[PDB]
Amino acid sequence: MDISKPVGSEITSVDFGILTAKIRNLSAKQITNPTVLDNLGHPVSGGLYDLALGAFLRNLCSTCGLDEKFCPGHQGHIELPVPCYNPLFFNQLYIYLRASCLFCHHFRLKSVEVHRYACKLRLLQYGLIDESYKLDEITLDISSTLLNELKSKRSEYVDMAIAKALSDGRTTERGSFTATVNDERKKLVHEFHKKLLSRGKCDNCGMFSPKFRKDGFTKIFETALNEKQITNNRVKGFISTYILSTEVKNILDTVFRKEQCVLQYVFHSRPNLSRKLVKADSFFMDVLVVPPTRFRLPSKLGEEVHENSQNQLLSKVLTTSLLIRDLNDDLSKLRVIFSRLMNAFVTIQNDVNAFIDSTKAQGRTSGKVPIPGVKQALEKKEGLFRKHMMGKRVNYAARSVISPDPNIETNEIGVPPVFAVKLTYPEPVTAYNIAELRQAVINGPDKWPGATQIQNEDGSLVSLIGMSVEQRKALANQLLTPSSNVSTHTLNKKVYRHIKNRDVVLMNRQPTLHKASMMGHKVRVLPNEKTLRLHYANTGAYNADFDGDEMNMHFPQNENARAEALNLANTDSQYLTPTSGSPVRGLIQDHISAGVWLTSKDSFFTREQYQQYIYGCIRPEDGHTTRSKIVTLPPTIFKPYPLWTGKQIITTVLLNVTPPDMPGINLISKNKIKNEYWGKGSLENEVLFKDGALLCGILDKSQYGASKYGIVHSLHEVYGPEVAAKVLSVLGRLFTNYITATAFTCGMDDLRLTAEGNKWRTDILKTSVDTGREAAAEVTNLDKDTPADDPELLKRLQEILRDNNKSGILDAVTSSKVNAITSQVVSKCVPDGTMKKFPCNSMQAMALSGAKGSNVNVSQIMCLLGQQALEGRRVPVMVSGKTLPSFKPYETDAMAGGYVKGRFYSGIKPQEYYFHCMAGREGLIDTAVKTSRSGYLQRCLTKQLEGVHVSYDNSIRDADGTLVQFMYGGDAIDITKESHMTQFEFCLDNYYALLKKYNPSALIEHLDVESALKYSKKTLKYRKKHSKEPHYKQSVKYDPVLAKYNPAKYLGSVSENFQDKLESFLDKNSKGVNEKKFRALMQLKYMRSLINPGEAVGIIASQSVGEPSTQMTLNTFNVTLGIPRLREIVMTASAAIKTPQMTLPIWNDVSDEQADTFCKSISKVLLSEVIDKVIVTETTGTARSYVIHMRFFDNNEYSEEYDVSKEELQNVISNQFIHLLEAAIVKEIKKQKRVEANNNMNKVQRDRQSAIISHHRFITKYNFDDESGKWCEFKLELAADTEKLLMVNIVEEICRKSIIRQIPHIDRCVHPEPENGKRVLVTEGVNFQAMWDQEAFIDVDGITSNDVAAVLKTYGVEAARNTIVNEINNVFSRYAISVSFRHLDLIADMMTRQGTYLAFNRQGMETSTSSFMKMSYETTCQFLTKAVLDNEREQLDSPSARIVVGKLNNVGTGSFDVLAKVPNA
Amino acid sequence: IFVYQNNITPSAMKLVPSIPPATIETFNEAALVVNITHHELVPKHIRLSSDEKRELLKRYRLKESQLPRIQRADPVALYLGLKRGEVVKIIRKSETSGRYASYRICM
Amino acid sequence: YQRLRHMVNDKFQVRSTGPVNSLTMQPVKGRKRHGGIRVGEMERDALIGHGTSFLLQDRLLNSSDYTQASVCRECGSILTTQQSVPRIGSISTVCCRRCSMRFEDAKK
């Protein structure tokens, strides 16, 4: 770009169409010669490389008259001797063929049925949808005076409807196409093409046309007809060969003259104002066009020129254009020549299919097909849209490995001089920068603050590389001299200066998950260095470690892009992350461990030390001070020797960098370091700032790390983002220079326990020599301390070995009893029994500060490693019952199961060395199954939510204009501004400093003060009186005040949740500040924390889910978790969840014993579950008699486990079971062809038995234990003809299918632990229709599922929308990841925007307005065909459509215009 | 309102749009057992008059088709008997703000 | 101590301008071909999330493939325009092809 070459005319919209056969006026070349070169390599005229298609091989162009440097290239056409069709539109001409009738030349549909769809689709090309459903309201061997009176009535309804709507402001002349109008249009056209599908005879004449058949997109067959149907068409309209493809034209070209009324509205989604005719030669191609020469240059690899791939399958069309041309001359003089002629029409179609696609032309079918055709150039991950429009490669960029630096600012970047004398900026030369730009031209391309090119006012460039200083001082003294032209008297010269210290740079670590990984740095050019060089405070936002990582450095090239990278994308405005409003920037390792030393109570400094530490961090020459003179403090010890204190240095550096005309900071916070670590009566855990003086407590990661509510996060709220960025630099240099004067080390003595504490861990670990056996004898239910070698114990432990369930119990009991022994050693020894203690022990000082490590790491060094756990279980064990060859089989020992009593100080034994390698590989193999997880989740969100932004009326809208929300998050608050919103006691202590920030003096004249405050007190009075009522009996006289008054214009129009907490604060606290001026401060703080209009909240929401999903990728610490659960909700919109559940609240009078009985009444009980044995005594002789005898459990047992009576078994065994058993026996024969002693039935048993012999096939006996419910007995007889039948295996499959009692779609109902008082029942499965009937146990008004589509089907779309925000919250709350609800509400309101439950997938994308979003996402030419058939005007307002056409984006700085106010008339 | 028990013959479901000014609404009485608007996840739906439907569209400068959509056969739209074009107001109880007035149109 | 073999020589690159591609006129790929840096799909989404429409304009139009091209304001097309081949005593101008009717179409 040049800024001295403005462009006056810009593109506003893109229409899609079809080129017709007026290519003849366009291209006058007619490329006929299939030969593309010759001998001597020259282009032969008439060939593909003809010189009227552009300049080529240092020739002037024939039509352009210009060389290769200035010709555009021109398009040439290939005459096709027949109308070969288009493989894009082939599936759609195949529908209008199979719907017409060849005789009547209409469709095979009634001409009022067709007329109704044309009448409705005319209404839907205006925006009116209710009228299109009010046309089916219009009805009346029907005589033709009735139907043409009906057609007069329907068409008059449309003329009255459109003329009424257009007389209002409901529509325009160009229609009112929106996304919901796009929905109802795509539902009719899918319907209209389905009732043109299966209609038998032409309902206007009677006779019917035959069926058509095709192949893979080349043949058009006209099939035959069975004899029952030929005779129907001769009694009516008399009172599998191939069709040549010029006749399918003349079918369709006679149809489209008659059916132009209906096709005028199917092919146009907005009104056809040009009223041109849909012609059927839009489906057929009488000419191809050839891309110009520049777009068809020859390929080359190595040094070997090849022929272009586009020309290899294009001259093949041009040979067949000539093969059929000589073969036509044989027809001119007049069998076998038609067998060659029909052979030519296949390949002239199968080559023009290959120029356009590559799988649509199969051809030889030999695998790995080359020349992928002009569709595969458009469709892939690479494609053309994604690789070359959506992302590009850029000029003025660089990359390098990064290195750390505590000596640059936190907002800066250290640029090597290699980069610095290469990247340039086109500075326009003016009267204020001629002093700088002269010296830049004099220094030239090698001395750094220099230049490399000057650009004159005619746009011509003058390079400076070869010149001496005399030619450069010649040019430098001519920068302001006006060239005497008249065309360019407006312009001035441009020096391309190097990159200086005032320039700006966008840096990005390359996997760019969230927008804080691409920030704006200030340039700091450092000599003698070869890598990019970054501060430690920036490593949290880039996810950066300095171990070979690279970062790209983009250098923007005008003042619009410098102003954005310094004010919108700079690192100072990225202090709080948008995910949950937490700080992400702060000091990291040595600076944490220096503040615990410097702010300590032993830290005393003399005057020469004190004044040196202040000037080591604060230079007035670099503009750190706000006073131009470093001010200091009196010492805290006067007389014996004058000494300063280390906390008093933190006070002084806040005094010099915070602005002078504000009061100091007031903050009561905590540390991470407990008061017991400092001795008796210390208060060094309370951090106290009082008027900017650190009076108490040391400083930690909790204060100047990336941690909320510390001192750095407090100075960000009170003084602003520029001051909190300077305090992170001033402290970082203070602790760097303090570490150099006074170092920090960790040694071997830091790892040692004292001689007493080393005996403590000996005495406790002696009490774990018996823990493995006592955990064993608990699991195997053996009492009174059986010895380990007891043979009845070893039989039981082998039984536990063979089962995965039983082994999980033995592991989980023993892992509890050794983690008891583990935590006693860490409790007894870690602070209290070490040789060196906290203000000298650096391994404890690093773990307690948050500098590096944890107390878990410290305990494994000094005490013991503990239990090695392998995917929630213990050490694996062989078939022989051994966990290593060192151990006895079934060794009941803690050590044998992998309980390491060794520590890294003293080394671990070889047995427990081997188990610790097992736990080291279980984490590394989980990364090995973690190839690509969340990269496609975030792409699907960001493509839909690309253009969703905050509008100026505070509504959340999409780029086409459709509303998504009425206010952002319900309250219109930026997440990165709400952190001290309800920190009322902080805001009350800092009243006077917060007041002049939120300065109300020159602010009350611009915004309304009384109207919102009066309406809020009326709603707050009305909402307390009806707070006792349920949510459906709430009266709606007063809506929320945010619905009534603009939050940014009316003071006091506040969300009702901030109003409650503020008024709860003012009345529970009795504290020269009133309440009436603390209302007005905090209500003004609400008004200055709002989201700004134009904010890209749709990108931020998708990045606030897509970035912490990368954290969410690990194993089990039942219900789907993490990313596979999140892909079910956000993607795919699954109505079939893997684990659908239902949460059932029970009443407050029902007990636990009543509820456990209730869970049994629901859960499905297979008949398998109550059966102890099935004994089958097969006997043959006499018919093969099969005697099936069932043993159940005791009747009291299964009644008290499954709530099943013995009378329920009878009505399942007799009624359900035996029908299944005989259905399996006959089926198995069908494939075969291809103690107790009991007697004396009574009458009723004898009558029950004969009742069952009638109903079944092979039974002949039945009994049941009617007295005790213990056994069942029935004795089948099959024939003598059949041979052996595995009856036991058949019974087992039938018993595991037969349900005794199942309410459908529900398997199991369980009674979990009551978490936070909600006594609930969780149900494996979803059926709301059935739990409504259980209302005497269950509060049916609160039953909650995780199945969204089940709630949508039953409770509606707002209940489905509250499910989605509760389900995505539960995905993140199980990882302790907190995303804001303002993100989750925007995702759930985008999914429910059509009343249904859409996904972020291709089908969810389908009903949207921008086609270039659709083409660039996936299936590019698929959506392209849908837009060409639709004559769609792309309005160029989605951000994917604007980058394609190069228009400025409409989000952020492009959501408004700037206009210059000129003074003269 | 025609409350039935098991089913309607689909030969008799054609007589549901039969009267042009009037409307016939059919309910299965197994579906009417629990009032779904009393549920804690289903917020208070209020249908609007055409006066404040007009005040809504003037204030946000909308078309009818640019609102969020509720279906014709939503279980709360069938409850309130909403016609196409009618705008219902939802008072949502948001996690971050409290009471929050949203809107949604029937198409 | 031990020195690892892999080192950081072939890792840095800088481009102010230079070679292009013939199809797209975008900067060529290449470490040693003096080639550009890719502003990918995720960085396009990161530049919208800041609301910086001009940094997106600079990194995707103004510094990649910005061409001022000719368009007919009648047929609305990029590729049908042409600069004429005039008299050597005249000035060439830009003219559409399919909007132009040839001189052997005089009608009266």
Swiss-Prot record, chain A:
Family statement: Belongs to the RNA polymerase beta' chain family.
Residues holding Mg(2+): 545, 547, 549
Functional summary from the UniProt entry: DNA-dependent RNA polymerases catalyze the transcription of DNA into RNA using the four ribonucleoside triphosphates as substrates. Component of RNA polymerase I (Pol I) which synthesizes ribosomal RNA precursors. Besides, RNA polymerase I has intrinsic RNA cleavage activity. RPA190 and RPA135 both contribute to the polymerase catalytic activity and together form the Pol I active center. In addition, subunit RPA12 contributes a catalytic zinc ribbon that is required for RNA cleavage by Pol I.
Gene Ontology biological-process entries: nucleolar large rRNA transcription by RNA polymerase I; ribosome biogenesis; termination of RNA polymerase I transcription; transcription by RNA polymerase I; transcription elongation by RNA polymerase I; transcription initiation at RNA polymerase I promoter
Catalytic activity annotation: RNA(n) + a ribonucleoside 5'-triphosphate = RNA(n+1) + diphosphate
Miscellaneous comment in the UniProt entry for this protein: Present with 2840 molecules/cell in log phase SD medium.
Highest taxon of the lineage: Eukaryota
Gene expressing this chain: RPA190
First-level EC class: transferase
Record SUPFAM superfamilies: beta and beta-prime subunits of DNA dependent RNA-polymerase (SSF64484)
Protein residues bound to Zn(2+) 2: 101, 104, 202, 205
Quaternary structure (record): Component of the RNA polymerase I (Pol I) complex consisting of 14 subunits: RPA135, RPA190, RPC40, RPA14, RPB5, RPO26, RPA43, RPB8, RPA12, RPB10, RPC19, RPC10, RPA49 and RPA34. The complex is composed of a horseshoe-shaped core containing ten subunits (RPA135, RPA190, RPB5, RPO26, RPB8, RPB10, RPC10, RPA12, RPC19 and RPC40) where RPA135 and RPA190 form the DNA-binding cleft. Outside of the core, RPA14 and RPA43 form the stalk that mediates interactions with transcription initiation factors and newly synthesized RNA.
Binding site for Zn(2+) 1: 61, 64, 71, 74
UniProt keyword Transferase, yes or no: yes
Residues with PTM Phosphoserine: 807, 1438
A GO-annotated cellular component: nucleus
Protein name listed in UniProt: DNA-directed RNA polymerase I subunit RPA190
Region (Bridging helix): 910-922
Curated annotation (Swiss-Prot), chain B:
Cleaved signal peptide residues: none
Source organism superkingdom: Eukaryota
Subcellular location, record wording: Nucleus
Role played: DNA-dependent RNA polymerases catalyze the transcription of DNA into RNA using the four ribonucleoside triphosphates as substrates. Common component of RNA polymerases I, II and III which synthesize ribosomal RNA precursors, mRNA precursors and many functional non-coding RNAs, and small RNAs, such as 5S rRNA and tRNAs, respectively. Pol II is the central component of the basal RNA polymerase II transcription machinery. RNA polymerase complexes are composed of mobile elements that move relative to each other.
Subunit structure: Component of the RNA polymerase I (Pol I), RNA polymerase II (Pol II) and RNA polymerase III (Pol III) complexes. Component of the RNA polymerase I (Pol I) complex consisting of 14 subunits: RPA135, RPA190, RPC40, RPA14, RPB5, RPO26, RPA43, RPB8, RPA12, RPB10, RPC19, RPC10, RPA49 and RPA34. The complex is composed of a horseshoe-shaped core containing ten subunits (RPA135, RPA190, RPB5, RPO26, RPB8, RPB10, RPC10, RPA12, RPC19 and RPC40) where RPA135 and RPA190 form the DNA-binding cleft.
Similarity section: Belongs to the archaeal Rpo5/eukaryotic RPB5 RNA polymerase subunit family.
The protein, known as: DNA-directed RNA polymerases I, II, and III subunit RPABC1
Native species: Saccharomyces cerevisiae (strain ATCC 204508 / S288c) (Baker's yeast)
Swiss-Prot record, chain C:
UniProt effect for mutating residue 75 to A: Lethal. Abolishes recruitment of RPA1 to Pol I. No effect
Subcellular location(s) of the protein: Nucleus, Nucleolus
Disulfide linkage: none
Subunit structure: Component of the RNA polymerase I (Pol I) complex consisting of 14 subunits: RPA135, RPA190, RPC40, RPA14, RPB5, RPO26, RPA43, RPB8, RPA12, RPB10, RPC19, RPC10, RPA49 and RPA34. The complex is composed of a horseshoe-shaped core containing ten subunits (RPA135, RPA190, RPB5, RPO26, RPB8, RPB10, RPC10, RPA12, RPC19 and RPC40) where RPA135 and RPA190 form the DNA-binding cleft. Outside of the core, RPA14 and RPA43 form the stalk that mediates interactions with transcription initiation factors and newly synthesized RNA.
Additional comment: Three distinct zinc-containing RNA polymerases are found in eukaryotic nuclei: polymerase I for the ribosomal RNA precursor, polymerase II for the mRNA precursor, and polymerase III for 5S and tRNA genes.
Main function: DNA-dependent RNA polymerases catalyze the transcription of DNA into RNA using the four ribonucleoside triphosphates as substrates. Component of RNA polymerase I (Pol I) which synthesizes ribosomal RNA precursors. Besides, RNA polymerase I has intrinsic RNA cleavage activity. RPA190 and RPA135 both contribute to the polymerase catalytic activity and together form the Pol I active center. In addition, subunit RPA12 contributes a catalytic zinc ribbon that is required for RNA cleavage by Pol I.
Annotated protein name in UniProt: DNA-directed RNA polymerase I subunit RPA135
Phylogenetic placement of the source organism: Eukaryota, Fungi, Dikarya, Ascomycota, Saccharomycotina
Residue window of the full protein shown: 1033 to 1140 of 1203
